[PDB]
Ligand binder design. Structure first.
Ligand SMILES: O=c1[nH]c2cc(C(F)(F)F)c(N3CCOCC3)cc2n(CP(=O)(O)O)c1=O
Lengths: 489, 147, 49
């Protein structure tokens, strides 16, 4: 038979409802159909969410897809926990252990705390919009004690649309006083586009500035505005476009016309829409495991009223929750596995970074491993260090008190060692001291015509410079270049 | 929700009652919609909400006056979430403006079987700066657990 | 548009716009940022005519 479900969509979730219907037609199978009843409402209103939940509950559904806000999350988790209806959601994962709520959004408290340590920040601003709990602000403040962080938290989300420019430009003038160059933008797309419009306008997208965008949606804003300028911006991505399942999806996603699928004719999908697409895979695969293991369930003749007295559970509901949490699919976001609370485990968050070419994956974060860097750090560039030849003469170069205990240039001291430090500082290179193997200065054999010593290590190619007591001679400057004498004798 | 609707269906003229951080949005949305004015001793709501008459005064202004009065600039702020997080934001907004170094620690996610253990882990991270000035933004029961 | 995009409308930079039409472009784009821009104007809007 077909399976009745419900949908709580916001008024403005055009792409999310478009990606919902795309996932409908792709994961449907002749055996059973997930016939929905879609309600549109505002999710910041707990009266509307109460009234729409009870319309879905009276009209016999088996699970409710939907979104919630800060205002409605406690209406949702209470109704679903009490009436044993399951709720599947792309919204923020709840702060708690709520039954009958399956969270499709992974978590980025752990990944964001790993990335601040990776850049070794210890003083930074944190701009937060309220907007979905306040739990990531609270997670960096609970860690700021034991990680030695000085965090400047600014509420950036009470701002209205007519004093927008005046509030933000006055905001970064305050941080300018404290020399804040490191900022985390814990906002969503529409708010993070407004902030990067203002950091460009007042010239804070230049070098010296670092930005971390604490979304799961790094390449969902307009990053081409801040891509040149010099500021380093970093972020997180759960939708890897360099995967086979995603690239096959973008193929059919980009060809859709924006009359039957608004917000679809493009090559990037928002992560909340990717999780809406993945949630149809999760529901369908779980209702397939419902009819597979012969657990066959009916709703009731009436479903009663949500505000019943007493409101009674229904024993089939525990099975449906347990079936929704055993799902082990692969979706646009990666591995979709839930724990017993309904929160995603075994997931991956790609740590991106904006370069002049574009956004560049510089690693990932897994729950079990940690932040894992990926293989691209081999191709940066390096300094091209300079090999410098010396010789053991006191006091020019002579080995220090502990030869073997020290490693590198620090094995050596003397006049020419202090001279090599001064030549390198003015020219601008990095050097690696090297005693000449033959332990000689350089002379030419009458038969073989081969230059020995530090001279032949410059004539033939072993070295680039010879800082030494090396006498400026006629027969030597025919084959090498001396400077003016640093010591007359 | 069920008990608001039992009194809306008995037809009352106003409702006296309490709310939590979990039920504040249920109350202010129903009373804002069905016009069933709510008189409450609970915490003042974070925003402008119609048909809610709030008998508890406020404390954000009196608390930021007292921090300035003692000339505090480095302190710990131990909070509990149950009255919202409005006063945490108020001392964090005023810390940016006035160069305070607040250590905000959520002390309300602590249960009865991990009290003596995590409280010693609490007061350990205070000794990393040797915090001597502590604000206890909890209610009566939790402030006795800390004292 | 390009000096904003690559961050050269910040302090330290000075620009002279050699038109007779200073307030005929979009100067509100570069007005904050810190760069000093200067120019010329033959049409004084603070005149009676
Ligand atoms: O370029 C040259 N620079 C040299 C520098 C020095 C030193 F003084 F140590 F710096 C000396 N020594 C002189 C005293 O006894 C120890 C070695 C020899 C050098 N020789 C070989 P020489 O001059 O033919 O004997 C060179 O060829």
């Amino acid at each position: 038979n077909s399976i009745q479900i419900g949908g709580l969509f916001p008024r403005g979730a055009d792409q999310e409802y478009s990606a919902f219907r795309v996932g409908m037609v792709q994961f449907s199978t002749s055996e059973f159909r997930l016939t929905p009843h879609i309600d549109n409402l505002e999710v910041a209103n707990s009266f509307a969410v109460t009234n729409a939940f009870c319309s879905q509950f009276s009209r016999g559904v088996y699970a409710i897809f939907g979104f919630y806000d800060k205002k409605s999350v406690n209406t949702i988790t209470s109704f679903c926990g009490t009436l044993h209806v399951s709720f599947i959601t792309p919204s923020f994962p709840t702060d708690g252990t709520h039954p009958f709520v399956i969270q499709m959004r992974p978590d980025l408290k752990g990944a964001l705390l790993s990335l601040i340590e990776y850049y070794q920040w210890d003083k930074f601003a944190y701009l937060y919009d309220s907007d979905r709990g306040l739990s990531t602000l609270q997670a960096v403040l609970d860690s700021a004690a034991e990680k030695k962080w000085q965090v400047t938290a600014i509420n950036v989300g009470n701002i209205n649309n007519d004093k927008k420019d005046e509030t933000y430009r006055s905001l970064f003038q305050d941080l300018e006083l404290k020399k804040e160059r490191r900022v985390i933008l814990d906002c969503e797309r529409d708010k993070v586009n407004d902030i990067v419009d203002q950091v460009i306008t007042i010239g804070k997208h230049v070098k010296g500035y670092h930005y971390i965008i604490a979304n799961l949606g790094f390449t969902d804003g307009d990053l081409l505005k801040i891509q040149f300028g010099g500021a380093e911006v970093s972020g997180f991505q759960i939708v890897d476009y360099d995967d086979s399942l995603v690239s096959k999806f973008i193929e059919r996603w980009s060809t859709l016309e924006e009359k039957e699928y608004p917000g679809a004719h493009t090559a990037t999908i928002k992560y909340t829409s990717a999780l809406t697409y993945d949630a149809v895979q999760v529901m369908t695969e779980a209702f397939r495991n419902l009819r597979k293991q012969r657990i066959e369930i009916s709703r009731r003749g009436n479903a009663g009223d949500c505000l019943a007295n007493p409101a009674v559970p229904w024993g089939q509901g525990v099975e449906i929750e347990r079936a929704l949490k055993q799902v082990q699919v692969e979706g646009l976001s990666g591995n979709i596995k839930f724990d017993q609370n309904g929160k995603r485990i075994n997931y991956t968050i790609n740590i991106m970074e904006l370069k002049t070419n574009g956004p560049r994956k510089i690693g990932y974060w897994s729950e079990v491993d940690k932040m894992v860097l990926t293989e691209d750090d081999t191709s940066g560039l390096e300094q091209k260090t300079v090999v410098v030849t010396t010789i053991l003469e006191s006091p020019y170069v002579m080995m220090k008190k502990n030869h073997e205990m020290l490693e590198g240039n620090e094995r050596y001291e003397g006049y020419c060692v202090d001279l090599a430090a001064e030549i390198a500082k003015h020219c601008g290179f990095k050097y690696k001291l090297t005693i000449v193997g033959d332990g000689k200065y350089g002379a030419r054999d009458a038969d073989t015509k081969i230059w020995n010593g530090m001279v032949g290590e410059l004539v033939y190619g072993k070295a680039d410079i010879a800082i030494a007591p090396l006498t400026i001679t006629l027969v030597r400057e025919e084959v090498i270049d001396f400077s003016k004498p640093f010591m007359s004798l």
